[PDB]
Amino acid sequence: YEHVTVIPNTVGVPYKTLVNRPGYSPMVLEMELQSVTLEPTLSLDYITCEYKTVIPSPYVKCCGTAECKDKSLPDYSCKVFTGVYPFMWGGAYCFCDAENTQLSEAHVEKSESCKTEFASAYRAHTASASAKLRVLYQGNNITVAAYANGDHAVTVKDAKFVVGPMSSAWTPFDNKIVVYKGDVYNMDYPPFGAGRPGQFGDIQSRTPESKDVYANTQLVLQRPAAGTVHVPYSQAPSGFKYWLKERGASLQHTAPFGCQIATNPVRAVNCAVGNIPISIDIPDAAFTRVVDAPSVTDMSCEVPACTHSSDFGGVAIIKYTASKKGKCAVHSMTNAVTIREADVEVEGNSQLQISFSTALASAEFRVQVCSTQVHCAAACHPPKDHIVNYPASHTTLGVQDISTTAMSWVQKITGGVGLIVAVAALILIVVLCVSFSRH
């Protein structure tokens, strides 16, 4: 047998789905979402890290002049100066008072630290869904894992489960993302080869190991301090290290629906959006012919007390009489109320208790068991607490709601005098019809 259902995309909220098959006892299964993972694409746009500035020993000269020869290196720069008269510990370096010259040059390269610490920019666009389910089958909890895209089919305990596709294509991610060691950020990185100094992307590297790099750091030299031998540099401050200082809030806090985000691999998990379709092919072995199930008769219901709450605040006692000892499923056919229990053993002329959750001020509903219906009417009361920690979406109430006793009040209010006014209009128009024929 094949059964298809749909459930809200929520985690930790048990769901009852009643599959019925003529000629056999109908059975209701409990399905729970352990977690749902969304794996986005991974197109590594590039990486970046802190840079090291290499400035070899400056070239000094006397009574002669140096010269700049271009170097095919990133952001390589050079300069010359004249008239410098450096002094060392033992005295002047050389005699030429002003005929001397100084040549300096520098460049910037990647740091070995990049091999361990860095920030990587990807252009992830799409994603795939995988999920974990817990199912109450034959009186035991069973775990299943499958891709929640409507394609993956999984066989367990002789039954075939298919999940997905996700109703909503929404994702918390973005086309372009930047990832640190364990943090993710939605942020539009500058295009490769156009890094703006002092900002993210100031140095661009294709891979942590690729020797080729790109840089933009305005490396300008300056005239050295008089009387000293040294090289000054106007090295641009590293925007990469700085961006780590102003990273801002991570996406695990800014993600709508709070989809928890992990790494290695990067996934977004546990966000409630849309719903999921599930198709279950269940072999008939689990199915039991109706004759096998014990009968039921003399059904009475009572509610000693009930309390509409996020928990199972409602308790109902039912008196039942059955043919023989045996298991029997229990369900509520009204979505406004949910029942924690799935089935129960029935011996005969006995009673039982059931714990349920509702949201109506007055709970008036039918309950199905052993292919029989029993009414239940009660007046719940508001609990004391206004907010709770654990989640509970079972007790969902639409705009339609039970006015309870006040229902009668509005039923009494609905009475109007339109009938009498129409009667008066008819009477006047007829007594006029003596003179009013067809106008």
Add this chain to the structure above:
Amino acid sequence: YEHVTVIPNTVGVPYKTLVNRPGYSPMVLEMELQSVTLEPTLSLDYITC
């Protein structure tokens, strides 16, 4: 659970107060006044003999 009540200021007369809580069996408590003491201020104006 919190319950508030008021009882006449009298001694030796038992009082029944029924506290009820939905979802549980209501319970009625017996409260009796053994005695009530009023201690006034003490500002010794003076003494004599």
